[PDB]
Enzyme design. Structure first.
Site, PDB file in Angstrom:
ATOM      1  N   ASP A   1       1.284  -3.398  -7.062  1.00  0.00           N
ATOM      2  CA  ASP A   1       2.534  -3.251  -7.676  1.00  0.00           C
ATOM      3  C   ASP A   1       3.023  -3.722  -8.863  1.00  0.00           C
ATOM      4  OD1 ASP A   1       3.060  -3.165  -4.740  1.00  0.00           O
ATOM      5  OD2 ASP A   1       2.936  -5.444  -3.652  1.00  0.00           O
TER       6      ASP A   1
ATOM      7  N   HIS B   1       7.558  -1.473   1.492  1.00  0.00           N
ATOM      8  CA  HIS B   1       7.239  -0.864   0.103  1.00  0.00           C
ATOM      9  C   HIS B   1       6.521   0.832   1.344  1.00  0.00           C
ATOM     10  CE1 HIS B   1       5.386  -4.323  -2.273  1.00  0.00           C
ATOM     11  NE2 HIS B   1       7.214  -4.077  -2.720  1.00  0.00           N
TER      12      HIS B   1
ATOM     13  N   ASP C   1       3.850   3.111   1.134  1.00  0.00           N
ATOM     14  CA  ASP C   1       2.242   2.475   1.477  1.00  0.00           C
ATOM     15  C   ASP C   1       2.085   1.656   2.573  1.00  0.00           C
ATOM     16  OD1 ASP C   1       2.860   0.406  -0.156  1.00  0.00           O
ATOM     17  OD2 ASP C   1       1.111   0.585  -0.997  1.00  0.00           O
TER      18      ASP C   1
ATOM     19  N   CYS D   1      -2.619  -2.756  -1.790  1.00  0.00           N
ATOM     20  CA  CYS D   1      -1.538  -3.510  -2.552  1.00  0.00           C
ATOM     21  C   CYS D   1      -2.063  -4.372  -2.985  1.00  0.00           C
ATOM     22  CB  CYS D   1      -0.834  -4.294  -1.001  1.00  0.00           C
ATOM     23  SG  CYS D   1       0.119  -3.492   0.357  1.00  0.00           S
TER      24      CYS D   1
END
Ligand SMILES: [Ca+2]
Ligand SMILES: [Ca+2]
Ligand SMILES: [Ca+2]
Ligand SMILES: [Ca+2]
Ligand SMILES: [Ca+2]
Ligand SMILES: [Ca+2]
Ligand SMILES: [Ca+2]
Ligand SMILES: [Ca+2]
Ligand SMILES: [Ca+2]
Ligand SMILES: [Ca+2]
Ligand SMILES: [Cl-]
Ligand SMILES: [Cl-]
Ligand SMILES: [Cl-]
Ligand SMILES: [Cl-]
Lengths: 636, 636
Positions: B329, B442, B444, B618
């Protein structure tokens, strides 16, 4: 190639989807089919088009005519090309079947509410939400509305619309919203635009058709980026958009307006966009037919005004006069073109002090826009320095609106803000020239285009000291070296009368004129390259040059620096050497110009002008008829 | 198609023109020819090429072999392809003749001083002073040099060059200046650039070859726009240019460097230019082979680090660890490519607070650039939200470097500065998606690309609650509804073990997952349109979603949110329903992925992660090998 939606159904409870007319909707299910599913049927209400298609190929086929073998790789598309009259008045039913039991295994019901939403302004046809250049291009044109159409206005400044025909300068934008009315009790209709574009244009909704100025309600402006259309007229709302700026360094020239249907029970489910292009400012070269001639009238301007009058009356031109001399240095009369109203626009120079008030006072009439650019941190070359060439072809590219011509220096110039504006117009790619060698340094001091029905339709005339060398030498070879130049003229300072022999035998003057012609030849080669002209189109005009410093002024009245009005040109009277009772410079000018059908009238301007470093073109401006070629199909 | 000069001569005194090698020079005269001129000859010193040509046609012909009938429409071109050894060591002589007297009427002599001046950096060949895209394109590439190559540096900030191999990141630029030395006693040689471009790059001259850092003298920088090259090495001066910025909203990415020969006796007579393009920042999608895997190690991260280690050891990847959890991130590892040194570059997120120090401390090694963007007036979606697709073809256009994928909302988003940077890279046109429905939001979280040798080389995997619906329903149809999901796990909060029957018979959860799949389906259709993928390339991964607010979090560990390292992918271990001693979610994942040659290793990350709303992707970042396709032949 349209918008794609996927609305899934469930075998437990029906769904209540809302669709847009013309848009396809893929229909699938949450979860799995019944345990023993082998086949399926699909049915739709009249006015609901259902097609079956494999996910691999893109051939569509009507789906409500047989019992299809089940296949997860098949997909059903639902389209409603017509809006619904009442909420959920149509539906789709999917039945799942097996060869074992005769009745359907399960149903899947989807009710549909179809709404016809579309935003359209002027899709120029002769097609997404993009603006493309060329003859095969499309897109709406938005003007800048830089004039004063209302008698009360003293048009971009007001947030209201207090004129009945100012609306002619704006662009229409229609929003059709057919469908059931109760849908709008549950859904919002929002017009909007990005804040950057919001600072560049304004939009007005209409609340009473075509008659009331207060009915043209302002809905989009500097701070107003979104608006809720109340459907005051029903199934169609009319908007009028007016631009607020010209294409500039930071503004590409495109503004987007969107409409959106929201579900505030909020989630948007459809958005439609419309893209306008701000029409640029286009210059008119001397080859185009004139409309209005402008000239000053000063405390001792007696016959120059009379000559301009009696010589523009041959081309049928106007004669607006300013009481306050360089009317061609303060303004340039171009235009901005639209498919509905193409209006001429003045560009006011930042070279102020004498006629600084003329444009904002006596030039922006009803249909006459005004634009100007002033720099933060001064102009010495200004709008005498700004000219434009006829349509040309060079470097492979084609310039159907000609190219802009401005002066400057190579190693260091006209102010950067004007340069950025001219380059951002994008339709007449400028060519920066070498003019720094002249005293005042304006392009029109050595270069002038003239219409001539041969070769390319025009001739580029360049001042050339070598041409004057040749003329004076051939006259010496005749014996007229004792002919005097400044012989016939009202003494403005008792200017000493020089002869041809005195000029030809003055070493400093001849060498300085050789240097001047070298400068003009550099500009000549740059012009031939960047405009694609040959020597067949280039004519050299005899002109010598004086000097009191390291910079160059004219010796006798500048012959190119003339007023070109179609078939008629006003040239400063060359008080040159009289050889047989007629000025030999006038004879050479005639031998060069009159074979092109033009008529040469020479104006005595020695006492009013040419003693303050100016000629007829420097004291006479003119606006011209716009190009027949429309600027949008230009493919930059 | 070259530069054109006109140098006029006089029959009274010779001229002393200075010419540039390869450039043509038209030769004409001031004034007229002798009175009775009928013919003419022209002669030139060895090494001086003289051609005759009509001004109408463009066929050249050697002019020093006959006596030409005089014609003012003919022109003579002089070219010297080789520099002179001494001032005026060559000359041209024009003689004018008549049939009446046998001797020449007059002569016209022009001495020539030829100088070979050229500025060249790297004319990429595989040609003016323009940068063009495509396989048939040319132009030099300039990097930004955002790393720390010297051991002392703590490279764009210094005005000096205190590294011996930092020069590898710069671009060469050679200036050849052959000719007579005494010419440079009269003429200046000036390198220069516009002030805007001067703020974007720096140039260093060389005063001692290849060995001394102080010899790389800074000549062009923030305030230094021009410089006088002293010819310290002779007939050739070497410069090294390093870029100072990436392409941004106001910077198109092109910088021009000019060289000019001045005559300060000043008047320039020749200028040459060189145009660099600043290489953009390129992202690497998960399909490319990995190089280095990054992962944190926290106060209670015991086996997640071990699993990442023991699972990246199968693809031969690195294992840099940070002592301070969301390492995917904070940074995105892209690269900037040059024909000499392509270096990877980290882009640091403005989402700061935990790993805000990692990039500027332990990621910019010798060959590792650093770039970052912080807004003036905050990030909530950041670099989990930033991904990139494989090369695709859509809307007719071809994206050989893939397209950028970022999230946001339609009616209102990631900060505008990052958006402007990504859009200004111009090589991977981004596609803004709908992610606002998720808790953290996000890209992803629901989308992941995986390499697969079939169809298009890859598969796009999307989370789909409908897939989990189908799986749990088919398992109910088997009788395993009493199988428990959160059965095998180290209680992190004594999370209650739900069963398949409890999930399927929970109306609120099922409806919320239906809404979630509708959001993902909108994103799916936008992806299929903007990436040109079909259902053959799209695989749905079963995933349900929790919620504590109007936004969505994952129910069980997110299956797409995995670490993709070529042939090996680390997936969060789905603590789903055990049906025959094996998790049925793992069995479905295997049945969907392992037929593509990939090997699925599921990682227990329930206690370290997935309870703080994150999965393996993540908490694991990775940089990849750059594309084989070079970015310059991209034709945007
Ligand atoms: Ca108005
Ligand atoms: Ca108006
Ligand atoms: Ca009007
Ligand atoms: Ca003014
Ligand atoms: Ca003008
Ligand atoms: Ca350095
Ligand atoms: Ca470096
Ligand atoms: Ca390096
Ligand atoms: Ca940071
Ligand atoms: Ca990322
Ligand atoms: Cl079922
Ligand atoms: Cl001439
Ligand atoms: Cl002579
Ligand atoms: Cl599905």
């Amino acid at each position: 190639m349209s918008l794609q939606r996927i609305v899934r159904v469930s075998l437990e409870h029906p769904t209540s989807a809302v669709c847009v007319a013309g848009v396809e909707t893929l229909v699938d299910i949450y979860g799995s089919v019944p345990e023993g599913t082998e086949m399926f049927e699909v049915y739709g209400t009249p006015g609901v088009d259902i097609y079956i298609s494999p996910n691999m190929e893109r051939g569509r086929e009507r789906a409500d005519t047989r019992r299809w073998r089940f296949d997860a790789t098949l997909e059903i598309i639902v389209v409603m090309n017509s809006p619904s009259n009442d909420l959920n008045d149509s539906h789709v039913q999917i039945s799942y079947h097996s060869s074992h039991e005769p009745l359907p295994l399960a149903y899947a019901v989807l009710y549909l509410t179809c709404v016809d939403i579309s935003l359209d302004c002027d899709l120029n046809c002769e097609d997404k939400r993009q603006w493309v250049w060329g003859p095969s291009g499309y897109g709406g044109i938005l003007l800048v509305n830089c004039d004063r159409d209302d008698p009360s206005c003293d048009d971009n400044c007001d947030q209201h619309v207090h004129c009945l025909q100012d609306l002619e300068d704006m662009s229409v934008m229609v929003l059709r919203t057919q469908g059931p009315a109760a849908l709008f009790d549950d859904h919002k209709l929002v017009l909007h635009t990005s804040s950057y574009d919001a600072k560049r244009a304004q939009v007005f909704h209409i609340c009473g058709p075509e008659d009331v100025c207060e009915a043209y309600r302002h809905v989009l402006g500097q701070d107003k980026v979104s608006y809720e259309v109340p459907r005051l007229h029903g199934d169609e709302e009319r908007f009028f958009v007016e631009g607020l700026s010209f294409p500039d360094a930071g503004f590409t020239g495109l503004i987007s307006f969107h409409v959106t249907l929201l579900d505030d029970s909020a989630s948007p489910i459809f958005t439609d966009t419309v893209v306008f292009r701000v029409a640029p400012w286009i210059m008119t070269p001397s080859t185009l037919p004139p409309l209005e001639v402008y000239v000053c009238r000063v405390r001792n301007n007696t016959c120059f005004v009379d000559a301009v009058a009696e010589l523009a009356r041959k081309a049928g031109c106007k004669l607006t006069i300013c009481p306050q001399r360089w009317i061609q240095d303060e303004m340039e009369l171009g235009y901005v073109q639209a498919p509905h109203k193409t209006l001429p626009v003045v560009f006011d120079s930042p070279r102020n002090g004498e006629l600084q008030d003329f444009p904002y006072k006596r030039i922006l009439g009803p249909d006459f826009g005004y634009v100007t650019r002033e720099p933060r941190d001064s102009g010495l070359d200004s709008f005498g320095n700004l000219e434009v060439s006829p349509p040309v072809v060079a470097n492979g590219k084609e310039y159907p609106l000609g190219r802009i011509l401005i002066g400057g220096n190579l190693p260091g110039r006209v102010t950067q803000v004007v340069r950025d504006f001219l380059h951002a117009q994008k339709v007449q790619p400028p060519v920066e020239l070498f003019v720094d060698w002249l005293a005042v340094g304006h392009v029109d001091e050595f270069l002038s285009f003239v219409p001539a029905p041969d070769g390319k339709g025009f001739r580029m005339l360049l001042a050339s000291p070598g041409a004057c060398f040749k003329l004076f030498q051939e006259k010496q070879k005749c014996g007229h070296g004792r002919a005097l130049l400044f012989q016939g003229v009202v003494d403005d300072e008792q200017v000493k009368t020089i002869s041809i022999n005195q000029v030809l035998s003055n070493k400093d003057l001849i060498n300085y004129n050789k240097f001047v012609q070298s400068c003009i030849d550099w500009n000549r080669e740059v012009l031939k390259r960047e405009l694609g002209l040959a020597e067949c189109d280039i004519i050299d005009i005899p002109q010598l040059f004086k000097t009191e410093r390291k910079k160059a002024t004219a010796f006798f009245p500048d012959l190119v620096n003339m007023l070109v009005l179609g078939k008629h040109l006003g040239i400063p009277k060359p008080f040159g050497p009289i050889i047989n009772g007629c000025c030999c410079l006038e004879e050479k000018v005639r031998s060069l110009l009159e074979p092109l059908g033009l008529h040469c009238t020479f104006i005595d301007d020695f006492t009013p002008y040419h003693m303050l470093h100016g000629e007829v073109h420097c004291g006479t401006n003119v606006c011209r008829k716009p190009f027949s070629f429309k600027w949008w199909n230009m493919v930059p």
